[PDB]
Design goal:
The protein is an alpha+beta fold. The protein has one domain. Helices cover 18% and strands 9% of the residues. The chain is built from 2 helices and 2 strands. The protein has helices spanning 32-35, 37-40, and strands spanning 21-22, 29-30. Strands 1-2 form a two-stranded antiparallel ribbon. The protein is elongated, with a radius of gyration of 11 Å. The termini are far apart. The relative contact order is 0.24. Bound molecules: zinc ion (2 copies). A zinc finger (AN1-type) spans 4-45. Zn(2+) 3 binds at residues 8, 13, 31, 34.
């Protein structure tokens, strides 16, 4: 159809990359924008 990728799960997500970064505590795949401790607001910041 068009392109092939697997971005992170979020409503404010507007970035698509090959491999998403893995949080230290959340250990989840996310973009650089959300990767920010302030953006994600990880409880175990
Ligand atoms: Zn994202
Ligand atoms: Zn996190």
């Amino acid at each position: 159809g068009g392109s092939t990728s697997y971005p992170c799960s979020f409503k404010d997500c507007a970035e698509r990359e090959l491999v998403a970064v893995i949080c230290p505590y959340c250990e989840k795949n996310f973009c650089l924008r959300h990767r920010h401790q302030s953006d994600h607001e990880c409880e175990k910041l």
